Subunit: 394 residues, 4 copies
């Protein structure tokens, strides 16, 4: 129980090509929802040398100027000069989007329980567009109720971005990676064994001002003091040689290729779905959000120390084929009872999720980097079902 295990998780900055594609997809989604709140979006972004390629499907009654939005989006993460390896003013923007206003195409189609079963229930009205598997997780290791490794990695990359943006370390460029290996004595994290920060930078800086500055201004700020131990914690700063060129020129970036960074950083299983570029009617996003919501409410209410909520949807069906609650020996009550408690407290049907979390708003661009979970100001991070859960449990 006191045994020692090494647990590793990682994050990338907003300037990473994969994350840049995610941000582009979600920026598109946000603009569309800003003009039309029932807009249906599946936007995929490919990012590569000299090029942004946006493809996918859109159903809306608004119009967004996509190329300008894309260039705007590329500018926000910092690719504004050619020397950085990518430049919003001079790169090509390619569009292959099937855009339909809902008069053409159709409205969202009828669920199985409406069409084959003949249900009059209005919350049954929207079925899952696709087959899906979703996992939500919460644990009291951290104040945000998140696993610590992904939390620390996210803080590292987030801070790495902010020291660049505020001008404190102006030699920094957008691309970046951070990795954290934490020592766990059973379920309790003790300290960080290894921190790795890879930061894109101008050749003006040399490795030792780079290392000292990143350790002092990024690592020690981003990682709580208790977990950093001098002489035992190993700090690796750009261990791969120098990192002058980064972003799209170096590598091809795609929407939905950072789904573990997006979620729990390898602490728990994942269902395979990607978040960005998808409107809330895609259960891949909304049901995962709802799963995080359920798990976080369950843990915050004191019914568990660790909770994993699994949702699964059959295509065309509003109601989940499976709902499960897992407490790895941490539950106040048996897991099955916790499961039924959850079934009565929560409503995992798509329309119900959308209404309960108020998902039809342009709120998704900030999720595009640094994780969808563990951050304040998101609907699925509000623990407002605590007392309902506590009363149902007793």
């Amino acid at each position: 129980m006191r045994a020692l295990r090494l647990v590793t998780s990682e994050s990338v900055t907003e300037g990473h090509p994969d994350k840049l594609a995610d941000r582009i997809s979600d920026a598109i989604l946000d603009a569309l929802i800003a003009q039309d709140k029932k807009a249906r979006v599946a936007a995929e972004t490919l990012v590569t040398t000299g090029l942004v390629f946006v493809a996918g499907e859109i159903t809306t009654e608004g119009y967004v100027d996509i190329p300008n939005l894309v260039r705007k989006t590329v500018r926000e993460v910092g690719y504004t000069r050619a020397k950085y390896g990518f430049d919003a003013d001079t790169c090509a923007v390619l569009t292959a989007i099937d855009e339909q206003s809902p008069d053409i195409a159709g409205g969202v189609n009828l669920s199985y329980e409406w069409r084959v079963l003949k249900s009059t229930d209005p919350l049954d009205r929207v079925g899952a567009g696709d087959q899906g598997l979703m996992f939500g997780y919460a644990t009291d290791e951290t104040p945000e109720l998140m696993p610590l490794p992904i939390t620390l990695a996210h803080r590292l990359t987030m801070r790495l971005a902010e020291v660049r943006k505020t001008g404190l370390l102006p030699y920094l460029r957008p691309d970046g990676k951070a990795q954290v290996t934490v020592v766990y004595e059973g379920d309790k994290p003790l300290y960080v064994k290894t921190v790795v920060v890879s930061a894109q930078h101008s050749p003006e800086v040399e490795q030792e001002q780079l290392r000292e500055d990143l350790i002092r201004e990024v690592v020690r700020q981003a990682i709580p003091p208790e977990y950093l131990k001098d002489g035992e914690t190993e700090y690796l700063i750009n261990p791969s040689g120098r990192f002058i060129l980064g972003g799209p020129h170096a590598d091809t970036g795609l929407t939905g290729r950072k789904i573990i960074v997006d979620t729990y950083g390898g602490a728990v299983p994942h269902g395979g779905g990607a978040f960005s570029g998808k409107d809330p009617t895609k259960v891949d996003r909304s049901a995962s959000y709802y799963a995080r919501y359920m798990a976080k409410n369950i843990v915050a209410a004191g019914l568990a120390r660790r909770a994993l909520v699994e949702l699964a949807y059959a295509i065309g069906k509003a109601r989940p084929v499976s709902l499960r609650v897992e407490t790895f020996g941490t539950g106040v009550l048996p897991d099955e009872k916790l499961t039924e408690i959850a079934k009565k407290v929560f409503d995992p049907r798509p329309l119900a999720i959308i209404e309960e979390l108020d998902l039809l708003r342009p709120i998704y661009t900030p999720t595009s980097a640094y994780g969808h979970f563990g951050r304040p100001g998101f609907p699925w991070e509000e623990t407002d079902r605590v007392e309902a859960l506590r009363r149902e449990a007793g």
Copy 2:
């Protein structure tokens, strides 16, 4: 031990736009490696209406005709007529690939333990190209030593492909999905609560002939009769209405958007890496394969009923930052002992992995669908270190 839990997993056929992208990427990899086995590949495929768009990076002394290869590849999976929604003969094939002759670029750069630590060890020479987190899994629930739900799902989609290909059900078209919800009594699978198959077909056929044909020719054959139980198991065939148009026309397909389908179907955590389009020097692929190799060998050797092997790599480093073996109370020995045994039996450095499995061969197209694991004839599915493990165990 007595309580009942629902476990859901799913698969897609080779005709799925995501999986089609995967197959294109791996076909490119196979073709390149056939002519040059020191070839370095990161090929990403976007698939959409009328278009295959291939981007990424390629180092070779070989030449592969990408459009001809793409069209051949689209043909194999069955998209040969416009009516199916995609057609190998008439679609556009776009290329944006940075192709490297090793004359330009360089050889792979020196690892951290070579450059910074001063290792003369040749197995230390190649470092992880990128930071990574990898999970390998095995369990004795099934003969393939894989979790049952993903196994059943894979068998469903695989066979759904084969009845189409043999002409047995000649109205079938390439796209398809299968989902399985299995009832678990704790650790033991009992029976399938729900089977869902969505199959693409010509509209000449209607759903009750479809239901009868798919239930008898796909479900009861692909799933062993013990897990099919009369009166309790529900069969859903095309619950989403009908499936006439499928593949790229309906949806955009991207490389590496089926990573859970590729692996364990949600039984265990995932590290986020995609397999297809990447040569074995990318640890995201080769180390995941190797982790599977270790776990499968450990379980097959009788040291555990279930084994999870975790590998993690720091960028530029040959040696893993974490290596862990977890048996969920199933180990013959304590997990630390099993870990030490694993470290003595296995060598998880990148060069060592490539050499131990001889991964530099054109063997990767068949991995593109129906799972990278649980299938015979792949180097990482060979349990040939069983007796070494048994000797180390005692």
Copy 3:
């Protein structure tokens, strides 16, 4: 003069890939200016296997959904099934347009005579966007006041299109070409020495039924019996073997690669400008139309049998650097007097042209095939300046 000359001219149908690109480009222009009358468009279309690629520059406060417009446009010229080699439903549509409101960008900046000379004349305010040389032609050999060879070619391809569209020859497909070689009495045509018609067709029909059908339903209708001479006029029908596959699949199509077909078919010099995809502020288009307008009016007023009008523009300048009129010995008056008469009757400044012909209307899609000149219902084909020219002449 009694000596015999061979004069050849040719045309293509609306289904030719070059002409398809022209039509796509002009359709975009029409849709944009329909919404905004000062919208600035330079739209270039590339057409190839499975792909329509739209690039160029757009300046507007309107929105046009390019992919649906492209698909509708492709449907109109007849590419509706894969069998034809191109299909509106299944092809890829790519967009790489710099689209700007004048929100950034600007209205056209001030002309040279406004900025450097200080002209207060509002018709002087818009200068030529580019350096240019323009030719307009008219001749009384045909009723449309056009050179006969190009006229007969246009009539041929137009009729081939018409027998295809009405169902008279239902095996015909969109692509087609026609060539005419005429025997000349120095200057006036006697008869057609050779007619060549290449028509795309289903492989069900064969060449002697194709030959009879095309000669009787296309050639003899489109060419007046006066010019067809038994025993001397040679009919070549598909001399290249069968024409099953056509359009974008056989050949790559680009905007502005049929400029001689667009104009006079080689009777007179050309300045190099393309028409399609350009709004009327591009003098390459508007000044050429206007040149045709002047020449046609000059011939219709009886001042000449043949008239060639030369315009030349310096970049940034509203007023043409040269205006010249040529009657190849056919003028009632000396060529200089015709020139000064024209200078008094006509105003070839860009804004002046636009207002005089009312060019800011969605009138350009029908111009994309079968010639910009020689057809009724176009502003520049209106002979409403006849009486003014006649009074100036006397």
Copy 4:
């Protein structure tokens, strides 16, 4: 014959996006012909912001790396920096080439006179791939036997390129235009009325140093002093305001959109065909070259002062449907006699042309700018048929 007329012609520099597309196309053609001399090439290039798009069809089995070749080609023309808006290193290169080896597809198919007529003549064996109309021109106004205005225009843009490339005027950027209006006293050019140079430049230089530098180093070097008259010749330098922003970023460039600049600058009719990206079996190129060859030989032989040679081809036919020679009252013999003399001296069949001019060599890149005609060292500029013509004439 004695009247005074203004004759205007124009040119663009190699950095003009249209001309850059031409150069890329021909660079592709040249590399292919270097590896395979029977290579069949139809390469079309689109050039725009952040993008070079190469499409078309190639039948060869040598191999050329298109992106590398494209970037080299963009570099030589001077686009090496982001501030120019376009850069060989950072732009995306897209390929949609219907590549083929002649094992698949076929060898060139049989000409009409082989397949339908039964000719054993080997020079009849290759027919025209498409219908075509070609014009060749020569006149003794200049030593090169070219019309003077386009000659001067070409010399201007060429010199504007060289003063930039060599560093003489280091503030210059690649894009540029030149126009010349020449005073003709009937047949004889007398002097240049107007020269307009529009040159792309950095904003550090302003208009009066630009004007003096271009007039002194470009205009006066490029135009012989005989045609320049101080006090009557007007020099306009960048009359359209500043020209800081240029190239592909300002305007979209396409292959074959400068065909009049390529040829005779508006002196004579044109057939509509484009040259660049096409191998010698395309009569659009080879027959135009051969027509220039014939005309130049006729003029150089003293048979005429000015000669216009028209060729026309029916699709699938080796032998021209029309051949015409016109001397505008300048012929020693009547134009007819000149025409048949031309028919016996020359052989305008495609294969004969290819052999007579030795066209199967990588010689086409230099033609991509500054005119295909009037330049030394080109096969079609060689006057080696003079004495044969003189003897046939007597």
